Amino acid sequence: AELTPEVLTVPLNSEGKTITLTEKQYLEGKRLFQYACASCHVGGITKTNPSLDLRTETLALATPPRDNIEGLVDYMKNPTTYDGEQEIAEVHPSLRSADIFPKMRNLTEKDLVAIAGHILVEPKILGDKWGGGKVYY
Amino acid sequence: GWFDILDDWLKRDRFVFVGWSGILLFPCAYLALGGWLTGTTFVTSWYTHGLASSYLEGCNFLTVAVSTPANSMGHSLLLLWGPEAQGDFTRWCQLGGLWTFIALHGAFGLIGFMLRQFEIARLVGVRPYNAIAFSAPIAVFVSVFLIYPLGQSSWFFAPSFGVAAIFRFLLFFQGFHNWTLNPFHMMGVAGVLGGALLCAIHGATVENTLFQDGEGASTFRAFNPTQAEETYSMVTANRFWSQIFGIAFSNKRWLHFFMLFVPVTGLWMSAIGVVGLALNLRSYDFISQEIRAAEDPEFETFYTKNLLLNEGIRAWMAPQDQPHENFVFPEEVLPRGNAL
Amino acid sequence: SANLWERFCNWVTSTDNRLYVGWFGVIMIPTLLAATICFVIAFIAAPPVDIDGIREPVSGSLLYGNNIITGAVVPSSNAIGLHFYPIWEAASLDEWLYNGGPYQLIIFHFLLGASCYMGRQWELSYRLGMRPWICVAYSAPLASAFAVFLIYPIGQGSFSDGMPLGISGTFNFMIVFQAEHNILMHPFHQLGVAGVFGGALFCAMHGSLVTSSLIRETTETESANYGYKFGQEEETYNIVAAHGYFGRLIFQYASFNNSRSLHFFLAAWPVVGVWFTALGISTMAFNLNGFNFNHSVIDAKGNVINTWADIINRANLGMEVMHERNAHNFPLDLA
Amino acid sequence: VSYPIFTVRWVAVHTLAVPTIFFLGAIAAMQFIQR
Amino acid sequence: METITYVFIFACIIALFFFAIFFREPPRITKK
Amino acid sequence: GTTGERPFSDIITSVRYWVIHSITIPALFIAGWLFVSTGLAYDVFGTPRPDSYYAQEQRSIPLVTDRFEAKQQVETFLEQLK
Amino acid sequence: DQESSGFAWWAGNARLINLSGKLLGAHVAHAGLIVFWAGAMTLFELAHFIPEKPMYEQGLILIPHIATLGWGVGPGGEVVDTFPFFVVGVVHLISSAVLGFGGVYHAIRGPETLEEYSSFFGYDWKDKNKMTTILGFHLIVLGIGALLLVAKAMFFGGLYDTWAPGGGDVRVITNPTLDPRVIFGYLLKSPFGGEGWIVSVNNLEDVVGGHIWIGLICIAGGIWHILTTPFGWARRAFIWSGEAYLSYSLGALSMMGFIATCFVWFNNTVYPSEFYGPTGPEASQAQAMTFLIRDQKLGANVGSAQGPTGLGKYLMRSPTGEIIFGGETMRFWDFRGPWLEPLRGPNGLDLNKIKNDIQPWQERRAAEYMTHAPLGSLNSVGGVATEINSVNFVSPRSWLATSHFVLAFFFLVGHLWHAGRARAAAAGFEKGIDRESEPVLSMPSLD
Ligand code: CLA
Ligand code: CLA
Ligand code: CLA
Ligand code: CLA
Ligand code: CLA
Ligand code: CLA
Ligand SMILES: CC1=C(/C=C/C(C)=C/C=C/C(C)=C/C=C/C=C(C)/C=C/C=C(C)/C=C/C2=C(C)CCCC2(C)C)C(C)(C)CCC1
Ligand SMILES: CC1=C(/C=C/C(C)=C/C=C/C(C)=C/C=C/C=C(C)/C=C/C=C(C)/C=C/C2=C(C)CCCC2(C)C)C(C)(C)CCC1
Ligand SMILES: CC1=C(\C=C/C(C)=C/C=C/C(C)=C/C=C/C=C(C)/C=C/C=C(C)/C=C/C2=C(C)CCCC2(C)C)C(C)(C)CCC1
């Protein structure tokens, strides 16, 4: 019962290719997730919009696909609606709006990959907890 | 005779009085406290409750506990050499053998202690009203940690020895038994709350009706350890309360017995109520209320409100609080208000 | 007449009154009479009150289907919040009774008088030449009334969230409090029960010890109480025999021999403990709640290993999720 | 006076003191366990 | 019927309160 | 107001006491420390190590379900690398 | 000099009641501790302070006090220069050494009494003239301090105005409200819902203006006391003793401790939500905003939406008719805030501005304040008591309010204690009832 690299192997892109994170990246992502996400995304939900969660399946049915490193990283730079037919960087933290969301100023490409990895690894560990809310607490 | 020489030694006035009672008190009293402090830091509750319960696992002073045995054990005494543990110590620990250890030992420790009160009182030649008083904490422990689970399915539903583990015991009784609505419990708090009043008010009354027996402001030194005159004006205290409250004592002997009666009587009433909770004979509902509420959907009291809270408590807690039942409550079946 | 006003002040301050009407009494007596009279009438005949401001009236009076245990005086409406709602602020009494008008009239009058009651507990002590501080002991239960009836509503932004004036209504106040604040896991509360448990403990301690060490002056078939006369010179119990016994129960130096150090401890312990419990409610009135150890201990992989603190959380959820059914429209309970 | 050493009080004192420190040492070490 | 019973007992307690305060036994000093 | 025992005040003050206890007290401490740090405590009380609550894949709890064959059932729970 | 034959050890400082010299040492050494904290804490906060991150998410309570005075901050409370923070911190920390020096000196070296070593500084508690005079000195010292704020606002830079026209920004106040009708009007305001008494101040003009009045009034009363003595009634009403004077000041701080608690909890102006967190009402208001904004974008007619009770899911009316936010947030309809006001009309929330004048900066502001409500645990875990560990946060508005209520209360206890003692000390029975002449025994039996 441990965090094996077998667990830290998450899909990199849409074309099946995967990437293996390290215990250093995980913790770092986890720390960065608290720094800039937890405020609204504590435990994989969304307080200011509970209809959309951070479940891998939810991210898979997003448009474009956000159930991989490439997807999520793109989102953290230029976020869109679930259908992608609208850019929401003005009312959502991102690189192209770091002036509006100061927390996003420090964040570097290394940081973005870590946070993305965290979102894909947590449900591998927590399961239903990561998606659901108080019901699974 | 060796007996009287054995007696001689025991009843010798030491720093820590032993006595005949000590032969029962000290062994149990030490093992119980020892058993707790052991389990508190080392032994787990994983195989019994699916819980971490020790410092070794990461629990703090609040979340630590010596959890009850599994529901599988039944009312088994869980002896180290019993059919369950089979002489094994490690197994004994993991099956919650430490609970029945602490419980049964502490029980006899409470017997020995009151016996000490009786024995010491006899020697000093004082009245055993300290022993009579101590019967209230006994009844409580007996009723709650023994009688109650003996009426239930197993030791599992007894209060687990630990801070947080007792908080769930309160909330459980609220959710399942509606314990707050029980007349016997109410007398209980009335005794405890009222006893904590007598304690305060009497202490304050005395300290602020004292005679001047010294020239310093700190009047503590100005007390005569060798009786004589009353250290505080009983006559002034009387006239005080008679004018601010309308009623006042005027008989220290009655005043002090009353201070014995109130909290001891209360604990005893709260005990009877728990004894009734053992057969699940609770004071859960008011039939006249339920009948109207059924026919009339606009009838609402603070009583009905509370019952809905119980429903929430039971549904959301039962799964992880009663693992042996293998509960599975779909999200849709979970009773919930709007939005929340 | 030596001077009407001069006589009046001499009458008020007079220590020869059956009940000492003080200068604080001039305010206490009327306010308490208004509080009690309004209460008694309300508890019996008041109509249902829309407590949560959601047009969902709660009946808490006897004549409207309640008994002593369920009955209560329902807190003012949530639509009113912290606004001042006297009788002359309503178009009619019907409206006033519907929005929980009586509640404010009672709690304000009670808290005012009960404060003056503390003020009077000083005054009489002053007029009789005895030491004060008795009122200081009474400051602890009063500060609890203040916290429960005023401070918490101020903090939460509404008097509807104050503790109801009834048995079952108080139980509601607690259960919900526990859900929203986790009061059982708060230091100040634990200190409260410690003061209250200890209080009852010590109350029995002292009580028993003393009455057990009474000097014999009574017959075998005569009340042991008669062995004391009101207005004695000497003591009625052997405090040296008491200390001798209790000193051997535990050990000598862990036993009191000073009556003044004893009674101070007897007063200090519960008063200080309740003081903290009163400060607990007043602190959790601004949402500084009890410890949150939810999902603390986790295993090597990251799986959440439950504690009793988590089992407590499940019970709390049930309370939260179910309390005030139709009052919530939005995910977070920030009110 | 010529006080003794080993007494009943000494025994009592040690039954609580000796394990305490042993536990205090054990618990102090747990503060460094991780995952 | 129930309401009557509740108020009745309550009224009896208040009545007792009255007598307890104003019709008590005069607390006599020394020579008692 | 006195008994046979030597007044604590004197002993806690005596140099001899500290000459003894500067050795004894830290000894117990280091002993208790080692008791945990060597992982011995884990085996004496069957307390699971951080990597010993579940199996790698399993997310179920090792709940004891019958009293008499409990010891045997527990041992089986340790089998699945738990 | 002083030992057990004066007071007990646990009442030691009461042995200094009549030791002017040493009693000065305490106050000067004590005064150092306050400056020491102020200094050492500021540097502690700065040492942890992260510029590109909200102040309320960092456990700051002193740097935001400085920010309010227009120092190191700019547009929208943006932190520009951390030097003024560094300065305010180090300067204090230094002055504490100076104060600490005098304190220690007067307490263990200097004259144990003052009356002889200088009749000007030496004093007598019963000397109604010296007392009113020393009181007069401090009444001026505090008076100048009040003008020290007026100067900083009008001349030396200004203050942080959240109500700034172009959006929250440091502004120089050059038009202080001096109208007594307006200023002292606040004192005549209700302390309940709506009319919020002193805490209801909502603009820096009144803040600066009022301090001008206070400053002058304070110094004026300061001169008055220098050149006068207590009247007739003033002497026949009060108790004149060292403890009595303490008690009066104890109850005074208690009252101010309570007023400060409600100020930091409710007020939006002198406690900017940019530096501190969002106020209690503000956050609940923000949630109604957030989801009104969301659902409306999904195509919902917020104006006509019917909630479970049939009251109005998003919008409803106040008891006096104003259009307000719906839900439990109906209790917080008295909230006013820069982000929300542009949506308000002459009758409350305008359905037209709500329908198409919602700005993006307001949406994310509401989202911000909604997800940063002053809810947290003792061990600092942000959210409801049932929340999960992740967000380590507790609103500064929560820390300050709770701490200062605890202090204010105990000080009300301290007041009663010292006021009760002074009365008994004066009349002379604070040490017990006279065994011989027992007052009660000379009064007729009421029985
Ligand atoms: C006098 C003090 C005292 C008392 C009253 C108890 C009481 C108890 N202990 Mg205990 N214990 C003590 C001191 C004491 N302990 C000490 C000092 C230690 C440290 C070594 C322990 C360590 C300990 C452990 C480790 C355990 C207990 C347990 C128990 C419980 C069950 C034990 C049992 O079945 O008793 C049996 C009773 C007797 C043997 C009394 C017999 C007396 C008769 C007169 C002798 C006859 C013998 C003769 C051969 C019979 C001939 C008949 C013929 C037909 C064969 C019981 C509540 C168990 C427990 O708590 O289970 C949950 C458990 O596992 N104890
Ligand atoms: C301006 C504030 C002020 C001032 C100048 C005084 C001054 C005085 N008080 Mg006093 N008092 C105050 C506020 C104040 N009080 C308040 C607010 C209370 C209510 C609690 C009291 C309650 C009080 C009592 C009950 C008594 C005095 C007494 C006295 C006199 C002797 C001083 C003394 O006992 O020191 C001795 C100081 C101590 C023993 C220190 C106590 C330590 C406290 C209780 C713990 C504080 C907790 C701390 C924050 C936690 C730290 C953590 C720790 C691990 C480090 C002196 C004239 C005594 C006297 O003779 O009456 C005239 C007396 O009996 N006061
Ligand atoms: C704000 C905290 C404070 C302050 C300022 C004082 C101040 C004072 N107390 Mg005191 N006291 C306090 C808290 C405080 N107390 C508390 C909490 C208790 C309860 C435990 C007491 C109990 C108490 C008693 C029982 C007595 C006093 C007395 C005194 C006075 C004489 C001091 C003395 O004997 O010097 C003795 C000095 C020393 C033994 C050396 C101490 C070292 C110095 C003072 C501290 C150095 C500070 C710093 C490290 C150096 C900076 C140097 C730098 C600037 C260069 C003095 C005015 C006495 C009195 O009434 O005066 C006649 C007295 O009898 N106090
Ligand atoms: C009274 C004003 C006050 C206020 C509002 C704050 C507020 C804050 N401080 Mg702070 N602090 C203060 C005074 C204050 N402090 C003082 C006087 C000191 C000097 C010791 C410090 C030293 C300090 C440090 C070193 C740090 C803070 C930090 C913080 C922040 C996190 C709070 C936290 O985690 O504390 C939680 C604290 C507790 C839960 C302890 C509560 C103790 C209570 C009051 C004890 C009551 C018991 C009672 C007195 C017993 C007596 C009874 C007996 C006599 C019978 C918060 C903004 C931290 C920070 O900025 O990080 C973000 C941080 O690292 N503070
Ligand atoms: C609460 C403040 C305070 C008060 C009332 C006193 C009072 C006293 N001190 Mg003293 N002192 C203090 C703080 C204080 N001190 C501090 C903080 C220190 C550390 C540096 C000292 C160090 C000290 C020493 C070393 C000595 C005294 C002495 C004395 C006594 C003789 C008067 C004197 O020296 O003044 C004479 C000086 C003046 C009258 C003028 C000073 C004016 C200064 C330079 C300007 C101050 C500016 C001020 C901060 C702003 C106010 C202006 C504002 C209204 C606009 C007198 C009882 C002496 C003593 O014990 O004799 C009995 C002595 O030898 N003090
Ligand atoms: C904090 C600073 C301070 C302090 C401690 C004092 C202290 C004193 N002043 Mg004073 N004064 C001050 C500042 C201060 N002054 C200032 C700044 C001015 C200029 C305006 C004055 C002008 C002044 C005059 C003109 C007189 C005094 C007098 C007095 C003495 C008697 C006061 C009295 O009996 O009041 C007791 C008060 C009452 C009996 C009235 C109670 C009714 C109150 C005001 C309303 C209820 C209060 C309520 C709870 C608070 C709510 C707020 C309200 C706005 C709603 C006393 C020594 C008198 C004296 O003896 O002359 C030397 C006197 O005649 N003062
Ligand atoms: C089980 C068992 C047993 C027993 C054993 C024992 C008996 C043990 C003991 C043990 C012990 C005997 C332990 C102890 C411990 C203790 C501790 C661990 C403590 C701690 C403490 C602390 C931590 C403190 C704290 C505090 C307080 C509380 C007060 C205030 C302050 C302070 C903080 C100081 C036997 C073998 C017989 C058999 C088998 C079973
Ligand atoms: C507007 C404003 C302001 C201002 C304010 C002011 C102006 C205030 C004032 C205030 C005041 C001006 C207060 C006062 C107070 C007073 C008092 C508080 C008093 C008291 C008194 C007493 C307490 C007394 C008592 C008594 C009696 C009555 C009888 C006889 C006996 C005795 C003495 C006990 C500010 C700045 C904030 C800011 C802006 C806004
Ligand atoms: C009388 C008395 C007392 C009290 C005392 C006191 C209260 C004292 C105070 C003292 C004090 C009040 C002190 C102070 C100090 C301060 C200082 C000494 C300062 C320092 C500073 C510095 C050193 C500088 C600088 C810096 C910076 C700028 C940054 C970097 C870091 C540093 C920090 C280096 C007692 C109770 C004990 C006992 C009895 C007697």
mmCIF file of N, CA and C in Angstrom, chain A residues 1-3 7 47 50 125-126 129 134-137, chain C residues 295 299-304 314 317 320-321 331-332:
data_model
loop_
_atom_site.group_PDB
_atom_site.id
_atom_site.type_symbol
_atom_site.label_atom_id
_atom_site.label_comp_id
_atom_site.label_asym_id
_atom_site.label_seq_id
_atom_site.Cartn_x
_atom_site.Cartn_y
_atom_site.Cartn_z
ATOM 1 N N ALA A 1 0.828 -1.201 0.000
ATOM 2 C CA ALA A 1 0.000 0.000 0.000
ATOM 3 C C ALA A 1 0.864 1.253 0.000
ATOM 4 N N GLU A 2 1.438 1.572 -1.154
ATOM 5 C CA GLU A 2 2.305 2.737 -1.272
ATOM 6 C C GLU A 2 2.180 3.413 -2.636
ATOM 7 N N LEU A 3 2.667 4.647 -2.716
ATOM 8 C CA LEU A 3 2.630 5.419 -3.951
ATOM 9 C C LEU A 3 3.711 4.928 -4.914
ATOM 10 N N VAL A 7 1.601 3.882 -10.049
ATOM 11 C CA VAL A 7 0.474 4.761 -9.789
ATOM 12 C C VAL A 7 0.721 6.134 -10.412
ATOM 13 N N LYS A 47 -16.500 24.817 -6.089
ATOM 14 C CA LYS A 47 -17.421 25.573 -5.229
ATOM 15 C C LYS A 47 -18.247 26.637 -5.966
ATOM 16 N N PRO A 50 -20.490 23.802 -9.020
ATOM 17 C CA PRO A 50 -20.485 22.380 -8.645
ATOM 18 C C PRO A 50 -20.854 21.408 -9.764
ATOM 19 N N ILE A 125 -5.661 7.541 -6.561
ATOM 20 C CA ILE A 125 -5.461 7.216 -5.153
ATOM 21 C C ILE A 125 -6.767 7.239 -4.357
ATOM 22 N N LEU A 126 -7.475 8.365 -4.405
ATOM 23 C CA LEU A 126 -8.682 8.561 -3.598
ATOM 24 C C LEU A 126 -9.917 7.851 -4.147
ATOM 25 N N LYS A 129 -13.953 9.511 -3.863
ATOM 26 C CA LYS A 129 -13.744 10.672 -3.006
ATOM 27 C C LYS A 129 -13.334 11.912 -3.798
ATOM 28 N N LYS A 134 -19.270 16.207 -0.063
ATOM 29 C CA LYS A 134 -19.466 15.844 1.341
ATOM 30 C C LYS A 134 -19.977 14.417 1.542
ATOM 31 N N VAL A 135 -20.660 13.878 0.536
ATOM 32 C CA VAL A 135 -21.186 12.517 0.599
ATOM 33 C C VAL A 135 -20.082 11.494 0.878
ATOM 34 N N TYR A 136 -18.907 11.730 0.296
ATOM 35 C CA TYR A 136 -17.788 10.788 0.367
ATOM 36 C C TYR A 136 -16.729 11.153 1.405
ATOM 37 N N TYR A 137 -16.872 12.327 2.011
ATOM 38 C CA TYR A 137 -15.956 12.773 3.057
ATOM 39 C C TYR A 137 -15.756 11.719 4.145
ATOM 40 N N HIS C 295 -9.561 13.731 7.676
ATOM 41 C CA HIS C 295 -8.602 13.167 6.723
ATOM 42 C C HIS C 295 -7.164 13.546 7.057
ATOM 43 N N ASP C 299 -2.341 7.029 4.759
ATOM 44 C CA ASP C 299 -1.315 5.991 4.642
ATOM 45 C C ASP C 299 -0.256 6.317 3.573
ATOM 46 N N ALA C 300 0.682 5.393 3.371
ATOM 47 C CA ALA C 300 1.846 5.622 2.510
ATOM 48 C C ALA C 300 1.500 5.920 1.055
ATOM 49 N N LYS C 301 0.334 5.460 0.619
ATOM 50 C CA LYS C 301 -0.086 5.646 -0.761
ATOM 51 C C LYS C 301 -0.843 6.961 -0.890
ATOM 52 N N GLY C 302 -1.555 7.329 0.168
ATOM 53 C CA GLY C 302 -2.380 8.519 0.147
ATOM 54 C C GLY C 302 -3.817 8.228 0.536
ATOM 55 N N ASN C 303 -4.140 6.949 0.729
ATOM 56 C CA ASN C 303 -5.470 6.558 1.192
ATOM 57 C C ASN C 303 -5.772 7.225 2.521
ATOM 58 N N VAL C 304 -7.027 7.599 2.727
ATOM 59 C CA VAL C 304 -7.410 8.258 3.964
ATOM 60 C C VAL C 304 -7.737 7.223 5.032
ATOM 61 N N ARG C 314 -19.040 12.631 10.041
ATOM 62 C CA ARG C 314 -20.195 12.025 9.390
ATOM 63 C C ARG C 314 -21.497 12.420 10.091
ATOM 64 N N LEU C 317 -22.228 16.092 9.353
ATOM 65 C CA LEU C 317 -22.770 16.260 8.011
ATOM 66 C C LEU C 317 -24.276 16.046 8.009
ATOM 67 N N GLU C 320 -25.961 19.088 9.458
ATOM 68 C CA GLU C 320 -25.850 20.181 8.504
ATOM 69 C C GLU C 320 -26.757 19.976 7.294
ATOM 70 N N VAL C 321 -26.609 18.830 6.647
ATOM 71 C CA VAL C 321 -27.365 18.513 5.445
ATOM 72 C C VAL C 321 -28.885 18.585 5.645
ATOM 73 N N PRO C 331 -24.792 26.320 -2.408
ATOM 74 C CA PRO C 331 -23.909 25.270 -1.876
ATOM 75 C C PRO C 331 -23.314 25.510 -0.485
ATOM 76 N N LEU C 332 -22.716 26.675 -0.256
ATOM 77 C CA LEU C 332 -22.030 26.936 1.007
ATOM 78 C C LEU C 332 -22.948 27.622 2.016
#
